[PDB]
Design an enzyme around this catalytic site. Structure first.
Site, PDB file in Angstrom:
ATOM      1  N   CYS A 102       6.960   7.916  -8.531  1.00 43.38           N
ATOM      2  CA  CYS A 102       7.036   6.479  -8.785  1.00 43.38           C
ATOM      3  C   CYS A 102       6.108   6.031  -9.928  1.00 43.38           C
ATOM      4  CB  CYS A 102       6.704   5.694  -7.515  1.00 43.38           C
ATOM      5  SG  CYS A 102       7.986   5.802  -6.213  1.00 43.38           S
ATOM      6  N   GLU A 147       2.663   7.779 -10.433  1.00 42.85           N
ATOM      7  CA  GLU A 147       1.468   8.610 -10.303  1.00 42.85           C
ATOM      8  C   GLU A 147       1.237   9.508 -11.527  1.00 42.85           C
ATOM      9  OE1 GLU A 147       4.199   7.892  -7.586  1.00 42.85           O
ATOM     10  OE2 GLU A 147       3.747   9.896  -6.853  1.00 42.85           O
TER      11      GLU A 147
END
Lengths: 836, 836
Positions: free
Chosen positions: B435, B437
């Site tokens: 997502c 990171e």
């Protein structure tokens, strides 16, 4: 101290006869219970599963109180029986179901129902044993070395590790209740978020479970004793049973409040360690030191007599012989005589550096005389300030011929331990593990008998350029007839040694990983620093001191062999290298045997198969009968004979001849120096030992003829002493030779066997010159000595008529055994040892 | 670079429609093959067993070439289907056999024969899963925290880890042949006697086996392509099949010689990583950078057109949607929309610090427009020197409403990575995982989505003094009505947070041990430094960089809640603490729901049972109907309403109001600061993330009413953005608020969702003010932004008539998904998000 011998109770002989009334028997209950537990704990961490299995075993294992026992705790219903340990291995045992009862070394009875039960229980362990994981972790070159018998790591491959002196004194002083409290206090240092919380806390919880399992076990005996007391008609025995019940309710849960409680607490620890794992050489260590405060307090308060104390100790000596272990037939030949090598030592120094002799020191020696069984392996620490009275009492025991105690040199052992990393205070408190292996007790995972290494096989490889029976078996160091000097031969030998030593390190390290991953032991670990604090088992690196100790075989054979080569081939040129090589192949013209027949038969078969051809049983059967019946041309036979004769006339190791002995020293270094550089997965170092157990006989059977004059497949030397019949200059000269080795670098321990004619020990003057013999060796930095005292006629008669000698004990190597329980080949080895 | 969009081949839409022609289906072949292999390797080291199972799976797994595919490689026969991974868990799946086809989130078809096959295969894994070992390693307090929904570590509990960008560029440049040679070269540094030889060499051998398995796999496709070519009547397709056969014989064994070989090699690696393990967020990373040399060379030699290159990339985009994963129903609600979170990023900086934009950067954006499917999760790195043309092209894509790309701020991310230990050169080469990171690719085991943590549950515990439904559920921080100041309440909240954060660390570390012990991955590991050199898997500590990244939920809710408490209870004193507490319990008088009914029903039942009494179904059924039908006295209802009303009128987070926003910053620190102090068993550090995936809906369902005015069991906020309907001052003010958080300390990444009305993006001027909005936030050290672009009527109509919107994509959080594949509750959450 009061050195007068205490009387022997009439109970003792009856206890002893009961142990031996029937054959040792294999029992299936442990295997069933460990299997039952593991099936219930699948999916849980290994160490928790081990704790739960130990718990399940101790809750349910059949227990028994044998007639007249004062100290109780039996691992099998059959005296001298054994449980089985499928977590390590089992296929060997199933393969021996039909033969183990009558096999030549350490036979065991096994019933038809026990066979069936083992089959069902063992099936679970297929693909789950340490031995299988170990095998997968070994290099192919390592497997090859073992196949060609350079070394065997069988000991910890087939069964548990052991070889430890645990903190008996901790259990005595604070109880398992105290150990649990120590664990709970360490738990308080752990926080949920610590990177090691899961594994540390699992290990600590596993200890709690294991401690409560042992407490449970003791209380099962208290209950049994109470029930037996209720139906006991003999009033005195009933009281004995009631005392047993009171004792077992207190220990080992709580600190020992009496000498009998101390004895019982000790015994439960000694026993359950060997239920938790099949590792042997679980060694009581300085029993006269840690038992003494409990003895003294009872005595001074008037609640204990010397006579009852002696009776209790005698009872423990008997119990130490009740435990047993079944090894596969090949392994058993190297550990023959049913020993568990439970080494118990007396005397030595206090941490303060004063003489440690006390009343129990003498009573331990007396107990060996009273019980007169192989175990424990009684030892004595000798130092410059040793009590003369204790030394003379030890000598008196040795004179009986029982082979006890073995003698160890503080002045060499203490600095050797310090050199390998112990503090002086720790080293001063050393005891012996198993045969001759020194350790700081309660702080060590020493792996003190990790493998047997045959130093003669690399020598044979120099002659054969690394070939064995037609195939590559080692590195190619060169055609032996191309070597231009003795130094070149020596260098080839050094390299053959180094190559195969490193493979042995590979084998032991592989087995090390297998124990670390599949068999951590929370109960043994909790009694060894620093497992609790580190949060890991001794099998994973929790111990403060970590070693691996593999043994070198055949120093005398190698030294004399090298001397032959140096003198007769290179200097004096009386033999060509080719003659020597060929004479060795032909066993000096003395005949080829079944082993050679088989070897050549297999080689012929492989050649046929390799060339895609048929393996005709007729072709191979005629190869066999041919080898067996081979006769050499007379001229060739004659030459091999005179070659043998000039070799047997050379000066030999063990006669204080410097030029031979310097080669013994140099050759020993080819084994001991490389080893001290290798490391193990527990974060410690390798350290060489030089001792044989009984394995010099089977290792010799794997060894062709050697240039020292030794014939094919006969035993190699036992320990660091001279070859039998080669030391012809008396014991002082022999000691002088053996002390030229570097013993201290072999800090896993060295072993020096000597056999005395009984006349040598006669009278006070005999005992005194005996002690002087030992001190003369120790003053030259020898590490250890031990003695048979027996005449040849006695051993021969015991062979011819064993029924007259059912109690006869001999010293083997690092342990004693009943002579008539030993096989003919081992008996013969012991018999031909030089009589001084 | 040439930014003109390349035409779309007519193949693409047909490829896409084929993926979606039927329901995703669960297949049993993998489970059968891993079981088959493990049964054959019992007794061998774990990592060797994994290699052999990977080998056995890739040799035998059914393969298929779908109609018109240019890039081949399918993990299931059914498009968008999934295999199963019983090595991690399976009981959840068997429990859903009858319901998974029609469940509300991410349904999967499963046949009767597949059920039967899974039952037989799964039985083997009972007691052998990572999930079971993980459970045993968790503290009781940890299990309690999870039972009361403080956090869930489900992600790596039920399935594999993943969350990595592997060295795709290594495979492209040297092939798996090159990787094997690297392994063999490292093997030469290992000697038989090394303390780590057994384990290092086993791991290295395991890599060789795994590399050869993938080579084997590719060659199975070459063979299939050749056989298909022989029976293909269409002349053009036949040639396509023959090209496929040539390509698959070369890659990924050998270095890629063409752009198509590079594409196919990439895809095989992307695919088999997700056969080896079910870990998702396997992220292609800087695909425009490492694919570019292969594109450029082909192009300049004239052997490749832009059109064919675009077609190949489009084909890869389609393939990325062919892979799928079935999660248990509860888990699926937090990862809804069938995503595998395969993050692929374009642009950014070179190691030299210049703009990295190239031809492929634009073509990746075009491919997202062409294929218009949820995957890959296209991203763009924004920095001060970003190509304006690339930014505008990205904005054009976002304007379509597809939710792509997500926008990431180099200027914040690069220093954050350096602060956590990367070099500047490494940090400059970062890409995004899953997502939001960030990671240094090819060097990291980051555990980038290790858990979901509900920051509202510790807040509820402050009110309830650590009780949940009548039982102790957390620490007791004090009766909430006894607090004398806002600072005292805040301190109580800080402690509730700290206690439960540490338990989350316990849960993840426990799962970490389980993967380390039971599921090392030799193939994924060999493509990550420094596993080969260290001789250990990434799952054991082989990676250079090691993290654990758990996500904090509900920052807006917590900030506004604390503001309510500070203003209305302590300062202005318009509400008593007791009123607030009781209003929350009663959902502000708005009615109690099924969740509350069930809770109270269970509490009543437990009380009866605890008091040894009968649990009458009549008593509990009348408790339920009672809660559901409860009506409050009018005066009380009236008061709860005006309490709610004055709370909804307060200034809220997301309107650039400092006094609210400072509490958001302070509360975020209660999560992010403690986390950076904890360590994991791989030798690395924890680092907070702040993103929700789709889990803010189920986490909110576990959360009672909160003082921000949010009603019971409704969703908590998504990411770090303001609560829906609370940000009423326009997008610049919202950005200003959110940038007051410390984003850099949350170095596992933060997520800022915004929804724009399509008119905001209209024209070149719309696109330009869009870019300025993003830069305004990034200039205040915001880390990330992403956008829905859609009007409300469209989403409502898609709810009412899904058949008109089968292709409609929305942005969820950190990924995009097909709107009509989302459940009503998730759709509703997306719909009520503030429209700017």
């Amino acid at each position: 101290y009061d050195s007068t011998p205490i009387a022997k109770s009439d109970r003792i002989k009856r206890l002893v006869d009961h142990l031996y009334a029937k054959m040792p028997e294999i029992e299936a209950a442990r295997a069933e219970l460990i299997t039952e537990s593991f099936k219930a704990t699948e999916g849980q961490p290994v160490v928790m599963r081990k704790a739960r299995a130990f718990e399940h075993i101790l809750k349910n294992l059949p227990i028994i109180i044998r007639p007249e026992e004062l100290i109780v705790g039996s691992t099998t219903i059959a005296p001298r029986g054994c449980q089985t340990y499928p977590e390590f291995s089992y296929e060997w045992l199933e393969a021996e179901f039909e033969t183990v009862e009558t096999r030549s070394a350490d036979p065991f009875y096994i019933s038809e129902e026990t066979k069936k039960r083992l089959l069902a229980a063992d099936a679970y362990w297929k693909g789950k044993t340490t031995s299988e994981l170990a095998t997968s972790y070994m290099a192919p070159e390592t497997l090859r070395a073992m196949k060609h018998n350079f070394f065997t790591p069988g000991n910890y491959f087939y069964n548990g590790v052991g070889h430890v002196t645990v903190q008996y004194e901790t259990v005595l002083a604070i109880g398992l209740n105290g150990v649990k409290e120590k664990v709970r206090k360490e738990m308080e240092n752990c926080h949920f978020g610590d990177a090691d919380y899961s594994t540390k806390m699992c290990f600590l919880e596993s200890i709690l479970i294991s401690c409560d399992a042992v407490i449970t076990y003791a209380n099962r005996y208290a209950k049994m004793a109470e029930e037996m007391a209720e139906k006991e008609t003999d009033a005195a025995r009933r009281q004995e049973l009631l005392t047993i019940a009171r004792v077992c309710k207190n220990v080992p849960e709580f600190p020992a409040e009496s000498f009998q409680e101390a004895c019982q607490s000790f015994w439960f620890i000694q026993q359950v360690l060997q239920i938790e794992s099949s590792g042997h050489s679980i060694s009581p260590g300085r029993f006269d030191q840690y038992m003494y405060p409990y003895y003294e307090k009872d005595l001074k308060e008037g609640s204990l007599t010397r006579e009852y104390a002696q009776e209790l100790i005698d009872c423990i000596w008997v119990k130490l012989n009740d435990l047993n272990k079944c090894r596969d037939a090949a392994s058993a030949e190297g550990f023959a005589g049913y020993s568990l090598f439970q080494n118990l030592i007396v005397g030595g120094q206090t941490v303060q550096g004063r003489d440690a002799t006390n009343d129990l020191s003498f009573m331990c020696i007396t107990a060996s005389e009273h019980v007169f069984l192989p175990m424990p392996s009684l030892s004595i620490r000798v130092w410059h300030g040793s009590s003369k009275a204790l030394l003379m009492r030890a000598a008196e025991l040795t004179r009986t011929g029982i082979g006890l105690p073995a003698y160890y040199n503080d002045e060499v052992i203490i600095p050797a331990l310090v050199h390998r990393g112990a503090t002086m205070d720790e080293a001063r408190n050393y005891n012996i593990i198993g045969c001759v292996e020194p350790q700081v007790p309660g702080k060590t995972d020493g792996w003190h008998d990790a493998a047997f290494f045959n130093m003669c096989r690399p020598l044979e490889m120099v002659f054969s350029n690394g070939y064995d029976n037609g195939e590559i078996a080692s590195i190619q160091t060169g055609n032996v007839e191309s070597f231009q000097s003795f130094d070149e031969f020596m260098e080839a030998y050094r390299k053959q040694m180094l190559y195969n030593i490193e493979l042995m390190v590979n084998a032991d390290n592989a087995i090390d990983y297998a124990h670390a991953k599949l068999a951590p032991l929370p109960f043994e670990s909790c009694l060894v620093d620093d497992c609790i604090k580190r949060g890991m088992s001794a099998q994973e690196g929790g111990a403060i001191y970590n070693f691996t100790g593999p043994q070198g075989f055949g120093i005398a054979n190698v030294a004399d062999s090298l001397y032959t080569i140096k003198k007769l081939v290179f200097e004096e040129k009386r033999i060509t290298m080719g003659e020597l090589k060929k004479a060795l192949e032909m066993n000096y013209g003395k005949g080829l045997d079944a082993t050679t027949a088989g070897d050549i038969a297999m080689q012929v078969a492989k050649g046929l198969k390799d060339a895609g051809q048929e393996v005709g049983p007729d072709v191979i059967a005629n190869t066999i009968r041919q080898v067996l019946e081979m006769e050499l041309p007379e001229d060739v036979r004659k030459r091999y004979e005179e070659i043998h004769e000039m070799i047997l006339e050379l000066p030999k190791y063990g006669n204080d001849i410097d030029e031979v002995d310097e080669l013994a020293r140099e050759a020993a270094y080819f084994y001991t120096r490389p080893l001290e550089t290798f490391k193990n997965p527990r974060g410690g170092m390798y350290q060489a030992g030089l001792y044989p157990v009984s394995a010099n006989v089977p290792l010799g059977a794997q060894t062709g003829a050697t240039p020292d004059g030794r014939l094919a497949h006969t035993p190699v030397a036992d320990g660091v002493g001279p070859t039998s019949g080669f030391d012809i200059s008396g014991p002082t000269a022999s000691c002088n030779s053996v002390a030229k080795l570097d013993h201290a670098i072999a800090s896993n321990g060295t072993l020096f066997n000597m056999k005395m004619h009984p006349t040598a020990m006669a009278g006070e003057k005999g005992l005194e010159s005996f002690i002087s013999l030992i001190r003369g060796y120790f003053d030259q930095q020898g590490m250890h000595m031990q003695f048979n005292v027996v005449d040849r006629a006695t051993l021969l008669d015991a062979q011819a008529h064993p029924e007259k000698y059912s109690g006869l004990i001999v010293r083997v190597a690092g342990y004693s055994a009943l002579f008539t329980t030993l096989s003919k080949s081992l008996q013969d080895d012991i018999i031909k040892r030089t009589e001084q």
